[PDB]
Design a protein around this ligand. Structure first.
Ligand SMILES: O=S(=O)(O)/C=C/c1cc(Br)ccc1O
Ligand SMILES: [Zn+2]
Length: 257
């Protein structure tokens, strides 16, 4: 099946998922000089105080932390968005080296990793219906650079040895995703897609300008995860990022001057 290797990686995905060569694919390079400040953007509202985390899962291509989205508990509103989008999960993309790993790039700069907080538009009733809609998802993308440790990432790092291999999960209740946010909510936004198969074109991307800093030790522990299942030979889960795709007929808007 699809993956990130030479024989099943991003350059192969279009064969099963022809939308891979579509008109609004993600990620993209964010050219900071050509992004347009947009006065029509409303303030971004990240309301995570009532977030209810459930479980952490190695899904064979990343690890994901899942949330209870049966009610409006952790939501994203405002910015480019109309209506209320509920947090369903977050996951990461990262590199084998500190100079690569992010999916979006900034003036072609790659960061060590990228966090995706995935939300769905509650007018569509459930996540599976939302992905079939052009405005179904809002994903908040946050870059990670290597420097000082991020305290609010450490509870995630500490449980990774319990989900080393594909299909392993662990309880992950009472985790506060507010600890993963940078100070500033300044962002760029554009219409795009899921960056993994099925690559559906259902995502309003909101990528924050300010990266979070994480320690070399924290990112090293990401890189000890496995793509393989238990009792198979070890393939380190590294470089699980899709590279930048053609911008095509899109403008990236900035929330700031
Ligand atoms: O916008 S993405 O970060 O690519 C979200 C991806 C994604 C999220 C969920 Br939840 C399920 C399947 C998926 O492919
Ligand atoms: Zn992602």
């Amino acid at each position: 099946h699809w993956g990130y290797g030479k024989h099943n990686g991003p350059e192969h995905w279009h064969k099963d998922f022809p939308i891979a060569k579509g008109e609004r694919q993600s990620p993209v390079d964010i050219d900071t000089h050509t992004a347009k400040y947009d006065p029509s953007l409303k303030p971004l509202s990240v309301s995570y105080d009532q977030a209810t985390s459930l479980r952490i899962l190695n899904n064979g291509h990343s690890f994901q932390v899942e949330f209870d989205d049966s009610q409006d508990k952790a939501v994203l509103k405002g910015g480019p968005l109309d209506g209320t989008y509920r947090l369903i999960q977050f996951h990461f993309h990262w590199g084998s080296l500190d100079g690569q790993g992010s999916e979006h790039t900034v003036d072609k700069k790659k960061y060590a990793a990228e966090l995706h907080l995935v939300h769905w538009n509650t007018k569509y009733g459930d996540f599976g219906k939302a992905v079939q809609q052009p405005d179904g998802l809002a994903v908040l993308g946050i870059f990670l650079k290597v420097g000082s440790a991020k305290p609010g990432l450490q509870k995630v790092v500490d449980v990774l040895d319990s989900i080393k291999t594909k299909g392993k999960s662990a309880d992950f209740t009472n985790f506060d995703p507010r600890g993963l946010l940078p100070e500033s909510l300044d962002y760029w936004t554009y219409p795009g897609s899921l960056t993994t198969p099925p690559l559906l074109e259902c995502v309003t991307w909101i990528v924050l300008k300010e990266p979070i800093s994480v320690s070399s030790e924290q990112v090293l522990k990401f890189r000890k995860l496995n793509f393989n299942g238990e009792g198979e030979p070890e393939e380190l889960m590294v470089d699980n990022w899709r590279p930048a795709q053609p911008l095509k007929n899109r403008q990236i808007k900035a929330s700031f001057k």
